[PDB]
Amino acid sequence: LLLQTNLINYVTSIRPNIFVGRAEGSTQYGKWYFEVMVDEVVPFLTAQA
Amino acid sequence: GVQVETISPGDGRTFPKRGQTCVVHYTGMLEDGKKFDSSRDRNKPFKFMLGKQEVIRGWEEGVAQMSVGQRAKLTISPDYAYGATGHPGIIPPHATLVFDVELLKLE
Amino acid sequence: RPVTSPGQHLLAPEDVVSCCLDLSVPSISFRINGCPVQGVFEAFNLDG
Numbered sequence A: 001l002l003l004q005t006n007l008i009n010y011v012t013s014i015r016p017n018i019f020v021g022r023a024e025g026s027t028q029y030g031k032w033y034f035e036v037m038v039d040e041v042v043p044f045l046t047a048q049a
Numbered sequence B: 001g002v003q004v005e006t007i008s009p010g011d012g013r014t015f016p017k018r019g020q021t022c023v024v025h026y027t028g029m030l031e032d033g034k035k036f037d038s039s040r041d042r043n044k045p046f047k048f049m050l051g052k053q054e055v056i057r058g059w060e061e062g063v064a065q066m067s068v069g070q071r072a073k074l075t076i077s078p079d080y081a082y083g084a085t086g087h088p089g090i091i092p093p094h095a096t097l098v099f100d101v102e103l104l105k106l107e
Numbered sequence C: 001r002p003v004t005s006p007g008q009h010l011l012a013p014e015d016v017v018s019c020c021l022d023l024s025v026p027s028i029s030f031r032i033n034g035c036p037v038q039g040v041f042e043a044f045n046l047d048g
Helices: B057-064
Strands: A031-037 B002-008 B021-025 B027-030 B035-038 B046-049 B071-076 B097-106 C016-022 C027-032 C035-042
Touching: B002 B057, B057 B071, B057 B097
Parallel strands: none
Antiparallel strands: A031 C016, B002 B071, B021 B046, B021 B097, B027 B035, B027 B097, B071 B097, C016 C027, C027 C035
16 A cells, blocks of 8 residues: 655666567568677675665 | 575585574565565674574575575575564565575674 | 576676577577576567
8 A cells, every 4th residue: 555665776778789670571680699798797786686 | 494596606515503603684575576674775784693593494494505605595484484473564474485695604 | 487597596707698589480598608598488579
């Protein structure tokens, strides 16, 4: 019933300008692959993971 | 009634023993996902000694299976927890508790 | 939804995650440090 409050971390997304898709008669290839390597992660910079 | 899932592996050798203080950081949630406790919002690690039954059973059995530096998720059955009574105003009766525990150090 | 991989752990430094997209099925699959992630997304929308 009562409204709930908590402190949360801001989250942001980053993408390459790589856009792929499927359509009937489209000129795009159907299978794609990429990798992401993690260099540094602080498990708890704040009270939230 | 304790189920331990690893999140980040520990050293894998050192384990808590009876009569040894465990310094942990935890975040308690009810199984539906509502947070009810966390020692990180207080910026103070939680200390307790194994064997003295100062905490619920699930913590005593659950942390004993953990290693130093390990981050693990504990799913505590209500009967291994506050059970039918339940912490009034905090934890409802017959509630399964989910914890995100990290064994910082043994002292 | 928890998924099973050899040596399960939250993403940590020096980890390499490989994401595969196959629009034919369609399906999305992952590999962590070369080991397959035993779980795939499939049969999702393709309107974009």
